[PDB]
């Protein structure tokens, strides 16, 4: 396999380079425009406010930027992200390895505790997932059996029926854990269907960019809602674990 | 299993709620720090610049925030969708790290990211298992010789296996944890605490995105900026084994 790993490694590099070219192509024009918009705003501010040097307005933007970066809101001049609800949810984002990061640890104690909380938490959750996975597989296969038997009742071949069940499994899962949530979130978060799918997939892949987070909205008086979703994550991850492993095996087959 | 899963589930829920209490305790005190900092800046600025109304400084901060939201950067390269940074971003997808220190702005970008990640994470997963075993066998070949020195002091060989495997995940730890923490301490101007936090947040694939090496070549050692993806890939393999060993131990107990 040593030759094939160099081949596989090179393929992954190409995959990244092809991803890189596509992402730049799609994203960089808007990034350049934001930069131009920031510049247009400074030049207009200087023109309006003679008592402000280019370089002084430079510091303002830098210092504003740092504070926004640490989660300050432009809209207000006030003065909970760590209410028992969100704090639980934050702990959830760790052990799941999703790690949205939409709220950051500011204390050295917070970070040090997070190092150990994760090192113990992630594998602990890994065990629960395997558990929920095995239970879920057994549960749906037993359930699929009854309607699987109805196809067998109309005299269809056994080797055909396993694959039909396998395909049927994928459809059931998607409805329950992909499309339903996208429709759920579409309504609850006021996102587009594509924003919602993007969130769902980014979540169940455990990537957790944190650009989109269900419940996070400061306005909503829905703390019970946020953990409710975390039960979707628990159930969802196991479904997507299967999907990811199976498409990996598909890639093995193509290889 | 029936008892096991519901017991284990309850244990995890307890763990989460106890985690929650700890975090809130340490982090709720400082919730408003960034809002306080923005305020200190606005007032300090009005005091310094009498020709600016509080309301005029107000619009500026919103208009700046929307620019930064578009991915503008305070300038005083630096493109996060230049080929280097974009490579690294794609990297953050397949690794499932997903820092999000730079987010996708376009609907097309997100849509592609879906199929990319969907066909990319497993592809990487395959190679990782690959590079895990390959390095595993290569280090194991190294392990056997180290086992020989322990064997020629008449230490029972099963202890040598554990002792060597203990040494395995310690030499790897020094190589992949300590080196980067020292490197990052120097290179990123972080504390060794901030560096270990970054390293472990990275290698656990949590990838908060509060701390990022950046893989953006700047000056003096640009080579090393993208290379750290090397450390990540190699590290994730070592950490993969570390994660399983800890998990296996928890299963055992």
């Amino acid at each position: 396999r040593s030759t094939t790993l160099l081949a596989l490694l090179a393929l992954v590099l190409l995959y990244l380079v092809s991803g890189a070219l596509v992402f730049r192509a799609l994203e960089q024009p808007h990034e350049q425009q934001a930069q131009r918009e920031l510049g247009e705003v400074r030049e207009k501010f200087l023109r309006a406010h003679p008592c402000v040097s280019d370089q002084e307005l430079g510091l303002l933007i830098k210092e504003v930027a740092d504070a926004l970066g640490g989660g300050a809101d432009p809209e207000t001049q006030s003065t909970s992200a760590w209410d028992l609800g969100s704090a639980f949810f934050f702990s959830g984002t760790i052990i799941t390895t999703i790690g949205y990061g939409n709220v950051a640890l500011r204390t050295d104690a917070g970070r040090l505790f997070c190092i150990f909380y994760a090192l113990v938490g992630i594998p602990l959750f890994g065990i629960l997932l395997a558990g929920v996975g095995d239970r879920l597989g057994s549960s749906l296969r037993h359930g699929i059996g009854h309607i699987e038997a109805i196809f067998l009742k109309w005299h269809v071949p056994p080797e055909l029926v396993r694959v039909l069940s396998e395909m049927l499994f994928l459809l059931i899962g998607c409805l329950l854990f992909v499309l339903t949530p996208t429709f759920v979130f579409c309504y609850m978060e006021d996102w587009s269907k594509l924003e919602a799918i993007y969130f769902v997939i980014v979540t169940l892949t455990t990537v957790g960019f944190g650009d989109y987070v269900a419940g996070a909205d400061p306005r909503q008086d829905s703390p019970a809602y946020q953990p409710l979703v975390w039960f979707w994550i628990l159930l969802g991850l196991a479904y997507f674990a299967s999907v990811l492993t199976t498409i990996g095996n598909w890639l093995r087959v193509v290889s | 299993r029936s008892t096991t899963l519901l017991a284990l589930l309850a244990l995890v829920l307890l763990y989460l709620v106890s985690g929650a209490l700890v975090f809130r305790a340490l982090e709720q005190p400082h919730e408003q720090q960034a809002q306080r900092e923005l305020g200190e800046v606005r007032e300090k600025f009005l005091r310094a610049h009498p020709c600016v109304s509080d309301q005029e400084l107000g619009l500026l901060i919103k208009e700046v925030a929307d620019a930064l939201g578009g991915g503008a950067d305070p300038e005083t390269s630096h493109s996060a969708w230049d080929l280097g940074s974009a490579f690294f971003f794609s990297g953050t997808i397949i690794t499932t790290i997903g820092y999000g220190n730079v987010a996708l702005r376009t609907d097309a970008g997100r849509l592609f990211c879906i199929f990319y990640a969907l066909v990319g994470i497993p592809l990487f997963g395959i190679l990782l298992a690959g590079v895990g075993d390959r390095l595993g066998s290569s280090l194991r070949h190294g392990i056997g010789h180290i086992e020989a020195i322990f064997l020629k002091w008449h230490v029972p060989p099963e202890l040598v296996r554990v002792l060597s495997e203990m040494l395995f995940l310690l030499i790897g730890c020094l190589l992949f944890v300590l080196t980067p923490t020292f490197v990052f301490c120097y290179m990123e101007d972080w504390s060794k605490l901030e560096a270990i936090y970054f390293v472990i947040v990275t290698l656990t694939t949590v990838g908060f995105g509060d701390y990022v090496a950046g893989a953006d070549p700047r000056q003096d050692s640009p080579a090393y900026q993208p290379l750290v993806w090397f450390w990540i890939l190699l590290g994730l393999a070592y950490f993969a084994s570390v994660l399983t060993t800890i998990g296996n131990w928890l299963r055992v107990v």
């Epitope: 510049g39 200087l46 008592c51 040097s53 280019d54 | 310094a48």
Partner: antibody, heavy 116, light 107 residues
Framework: EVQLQQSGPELVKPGASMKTSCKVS????????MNWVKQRHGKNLEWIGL????????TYNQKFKGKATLTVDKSSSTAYMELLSLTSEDSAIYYC?????????WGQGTTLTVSS | QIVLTQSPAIMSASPGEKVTMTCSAS?????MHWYQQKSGTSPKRWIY???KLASGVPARFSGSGSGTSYSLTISSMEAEDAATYYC?????????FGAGAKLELKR
């Protein structure tokens, strides 16, 4: 009418330092940024640096970092530029000029001669 | 660090000639300003923000352009228009000028 009146022409020995002066009038000194520009016979007009007379905030052209010290007297609404360790390369006309994007008002200029 | 290029460095116009001097930016600039300077006197803000005339600049003078190319234009050259014209820029610290365009009178 805005007016920048600089101090008169200065002759100093090589190595010596020199301070010139720009008294503004017809507006408020502290309201607008003060810059200094160098003009020799053989080069482009060169921005030396600026001061915010209200804050005392200064930035310099990298080329002049060590050479020039900008200061104001708010009470006498006078801007000062100091040039250090003078070489014949510093023999030029120096202007003070007002502006944060365009230099809208200029002094009459002052001619520095570095000579033994 | 942006470089502005005025070429030719020197030019001549018979009275009534339309004159156009150009200023090239090394990288893209939002606005260009211009200064007129007659020997012995300081430079006077002539055009600012690319196409705006200063207090008493006669209307026969126009500015124009965008990106990395800007132009000062005289509809009809007059005697008193003979002077050095400099383009400056502050879309980027530090501000910079052209080496200048001396406009002589043809006779």
């Amino acid at each position: 009418e805005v007016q920048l009146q600089q101090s008169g022409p200065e002759l100093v020995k090589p190595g010596a330092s020199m301070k010139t002066s720009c008294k503004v009038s017809g507006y408020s000194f502290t309201g607008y940024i003060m810059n200094w520009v160098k003009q020799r016979h053989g080069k482009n007009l060169e921005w030396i640096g600026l001061i915010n007379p209200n804050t005392g905030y200064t930035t310099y052209n990298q080329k002049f970092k060590g050479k020039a010290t900008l200061t104001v007297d708010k009470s006498s609404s006078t801007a000062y530029m100091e040039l250090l360790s003078l070489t014949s390369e510093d023999s030029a006309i120096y202007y003070c000029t007002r502006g944060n994007y365009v230099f809208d008002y200029w002094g009459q200029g002052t001619t520095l001669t570095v000579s033994s | 660090q942006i470089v502005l290029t005025q070429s030719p460095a020197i030019m001549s116009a018979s009275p009534g000639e339309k004159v156009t001097m150009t200023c090239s930016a090394s990288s893209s600039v939002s606005y260009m300003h211009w200064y007129q300077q007659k020997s012995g006197t300081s430079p006077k803000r002539w055009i600012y923000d690319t196409s705006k005339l200063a207090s008493g600049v006669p209307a026969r003078f126009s500015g124009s352009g965008s990106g990395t190319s800007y132009s000062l234009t005289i509809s009809s050259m007059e005697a008193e228009d003979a002077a050095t014209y400099y383009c400056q820029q502050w879309s980027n610290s530090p501000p910079t000028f052209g080496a200048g365009a001396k406009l002589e009178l043809k006779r």
